[PDB]
Each structure stands twice: as C-alpha cells, then as structure tokens.
C-alpha cells in the first residue's frame, strides 16, 4: 500500500562536529533500495545531499557542498542507511530529512525531517 | 496541473548523439528537480540524470551513463535538455521525461520517446 520511513538521529554541535543519520524503510517496498537525504536550509531551496540505489552502492550521489565530509551507506542486515556526517559547519544547518526513492509509483517518500544545528 | 512535452529520440547508429528535452508547463513553482528515466524491454523504469533547480547542486548521473551523458536547464523556458554521446545498443529504451516540484512526493511522469541505437 504505501512504503513508511522510520528516521533516527539529529542534535547541536559545533563547527567541526560529527553526526549520523539512520533511515530503515519499510512497507511495501518492492524491494527497491533508492534512498537518500535532502535537507532544507532556512532561506534555501531544498539540496539533496546524497543518494545511494541497490544493495551494492550503485549511482552514489554527493552533494559538492558535502563531498569529503558526508558519507552514505547501508546495512543490508536492516534495510537502514546512514549518513555520517563528519567536520560539520554552520551553514550545515537544516533540517535533514530520509527519502525514498519509489521508482514503481513514481513517489519520493520523506522521513521525519530532524534539525541539526551546528554553532558556535 | 503540470504538464509535460517532450521531444527529440529516434534511431541512431553506434557512436551516435541525440538530444532529447523536456518541457514542464503549468502549476510547475520554481523549485523542481526534472530529469530522465530510460525502460528497456522487460526491465524496470532506470534512473538515468536529474537536475535541480537549486544552483547550488550539480546534476546527478547515473553510473550507466556518466561521461556520456550531460543535463542541463533552461530556466527561462522551464526545460531541460539531455545531450547523450557515444551512444551503445545497451542505450535503446523507452526514455521518459519525470518532473518533480522540491516540495512534492509525487513525480509527474512524461510520455515516453523511443531510443533505439544499433549496429
Ligand atoms: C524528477 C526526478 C528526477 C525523480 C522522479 C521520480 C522520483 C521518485 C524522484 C525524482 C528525483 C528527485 O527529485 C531528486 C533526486 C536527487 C537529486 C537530483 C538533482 C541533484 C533523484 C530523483 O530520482
């Protein structure tokens, strides 16, 4: 019927920072693993951070923004993604959200976005 | 309601180029991914390239197709191009224009153009 988006993590840090993100999907998936995150800055349009598609990591997407400092991954063991996010700045700052990517329905699915506020 | 046109797609020989574009109209706000999807016979619908909006984002390619492939925006006409180079028979599909506003879950889904590369 429809696919839901268990999302974990989110806080306060400062510049240079560390957090993770976890996304588990689950419902009626189809089997299909296109995840990601995107995240919605105060003033912004939307970025899409990064993105990640079947069990073996293919079409890996980084936002240039956040090369070098995000990374996605999966845990097959799950059906979890995370997003490390590591030597985090100010303009960081956002709200986070998990997406799948539904290419059967044509339906991007949105996990519960979680601030992450990075300052000095 | 958003409305898509598509053009471009054909035949080509191998090594060949063609340029497909996509053309949303209507409720389309200005804040929207737009990109393609390719269906070969038999196989699910293929993430091949998406833009967005956001300038601050570089397009994004599908492994299959980097390299080959480049995307690019016509703000001005809300249109995006697909210029695909280098072409191979394991490029022919039904290639489909998709369309997204940043603040929709559902994608308007394009009709589809023929792409047939061969011999
Ligand atoms: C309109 C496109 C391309 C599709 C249509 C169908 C679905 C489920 C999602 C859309 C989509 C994005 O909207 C955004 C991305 C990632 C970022 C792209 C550009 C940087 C992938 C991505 O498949």
């Known amino acids: 019927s429809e696919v839901q988006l268990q999302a974990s993590g989110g806080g306060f840090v400062q510049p240079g920072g560390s957090l993770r993100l976890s996304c588990a999907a689950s419902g009626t998936t189809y089997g299909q693993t296109n995840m990601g995150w995107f995240r919605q800055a105060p003033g912004k349009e939307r970025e899409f951070v990064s993105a990640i598609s079947g069990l073996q990591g293919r079409d890996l997407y980084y936002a240039d923004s956040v090369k070098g400092r995000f990374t996605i991954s999966r845990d097959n063991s799950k059906n979890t993604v995370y997003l490390q996010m590591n030597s985090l700045r100010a303009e960081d700052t956002a709200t986070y959200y998990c997406?799948?990517?539904?290419?059967?329905?044509?339906?991007?699915?949105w996990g519960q976005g979680t601030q992450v506020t990075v300052s000095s | 309601?958003?409305?898509?046109?598509?053009?471009?797609?054909?035949?080509?020989?191998?090594?060949?180029?063609?340029?497909?574009?996509?053309?949303?109209?209507?409720?389309?706000?200005?804040?929207?991914?737009?990109?393609?999807?390719?269906?070969?016979?038999?196989?699910?619908?293929?993430?091949?390239?998406?833009?967005?909006?956001?300038?601050?984002?570089?397009?994004?390619?599908?492994?299959?197709?980097?390299?080959?492939?480049?995307?690019?925006?016509?703000?001005?006409?809300?249109?995006?191009?697909?210029?695909?180079?280098?072409?191979?028979?394991?490029?022919?599909?039904?290639?489909?224009?998709?369309?997204?506003?940043?603040?929709?879950?559902?994608?308007?889904?394009?009709?589809?153009?023929?792409?047939?590369?061969?011999?």
């Open positions: 997406a799948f990517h539904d290419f059967l329905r044509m339906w991007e699915y």
